Amino acid sequence: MPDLGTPIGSVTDSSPSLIRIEISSAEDFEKYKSMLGVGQYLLVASGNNLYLLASITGVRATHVERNFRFQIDTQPIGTLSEDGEFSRGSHSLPVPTEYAYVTP
């Protein structure tokens, strides 16, 4: 319902048991590092007027040059609409190029 701000990253790989998010800017990461720890929750977008609630289960950071990659792995728990109804169960699947936000 409330404004969720500016997104951290986009989806790269999707599946009913795993979701991978990528960040390519260290300035943002350090900005929100506190809320990106294992055990915390993220909101992802599947469609218009719908969001999914996923739990982090891994973080990796790498610097390869030939620059920064940050990978975050998640596991979905349920769904939340714009009105604010939290329904457990995750049948839907998010398509790549969709955004991720930190849960206020």
Binding site: V38, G39, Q40, L53, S55, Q75
Partner: protein, 237 residues
């Protein structure tokens, strides 16, 4: 039969001056349970009990409580209802008296506790288990617990055991345990809507046991020992 430490079992005598007749029975249970109304928190001190009969004492107390609940909740179960007076049994340092591998000497402690595990909800007696070495504690008792609270754990074995037990806990969320700060915890099971990491504040009053400090006291001089009086009380009889 002579041993003075062990005379709460053998030579109990009434407070007035009389001995304990079969009718006095009620009184003993009164001290554990208390008044039905007006919540009570009884505390057994097992520090000064001899290490020979501890498991007997626990079994005895446990059976007494369980039976009281049986008899109280027998009829009030009019339709699928629980009792107004529910008990809670808190077992600290469980591995001392509920070992995974032990000889008959500690069997008496399993049989009772396991009863409460298999069949307690019907009568209102519930448990709480606390251990700093979850590996050594009996296996059957853990798997009968619905919710779990876990704080920092550093030894590999207990990490793996606890990681097996909790089903919703995956391989990923278990890597979190060795990284928890002071007063931070991970909660799982039915009570919470979603698994979560949280944090406690300090309690008031704090529990600080009357431990004996050696090298805080080893730097003072000879405290003259009135050996005479020591032995005088040690004559006894």
């Amino acid at each position: 039969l002579a041993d003075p430490r062990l005379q709460f079992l053998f030579y109990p005598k009434k407070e007035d001056g009389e001995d304990l007749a079969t009718g006095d029975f009620a009184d003993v249970v009164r001290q554990f349970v208390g008044y039905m109304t007006k919540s009570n928190v009884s505390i057994i001190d097992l520090s000064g009990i001899p290490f020979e009969v501890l498991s007997i004492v626990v079994s005895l107390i446990s059976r007494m409580i369980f039976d009281f609940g049986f008899h109280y909740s027998k009829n009030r179960h009019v339709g699928g209802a629980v009792s107004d007076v529910p008990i809670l049994v808190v077992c600290e340092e469980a591995h001392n008296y509920l070992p995974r591998s032990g000889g008959a000497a500690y069997d008496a402690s399993r049989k009772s506790i396991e009863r409460i595990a298999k069949e307690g909800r019907k009568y209102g007696v519930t448990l709480m288990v606390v251990s700093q070495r979850p590996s050594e504690v009996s296996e059957t008792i853990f798997s009968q617990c619905s919710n779990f609270i876990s704080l920092r754990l550093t030894n590999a074995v207990d990490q793996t055991y606890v990681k097996s037990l909790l089903p919703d806990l995956s391989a990923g969320l278990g890597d979190l345990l060795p990284n928890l700060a002071q007063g931070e915890f991970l909660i799982v099971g039915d009570a919470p809507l979603m698994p979560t990491v949280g944090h406690f504040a300090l309690p008031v009053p704090e529990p600080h046991s009357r431990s004996v400090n050696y090298l805080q006291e080893w730097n003072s001089g000879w405290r003259h020992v009135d050996f005479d009086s020591v032995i005088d009380r040690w004559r006894g009889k």
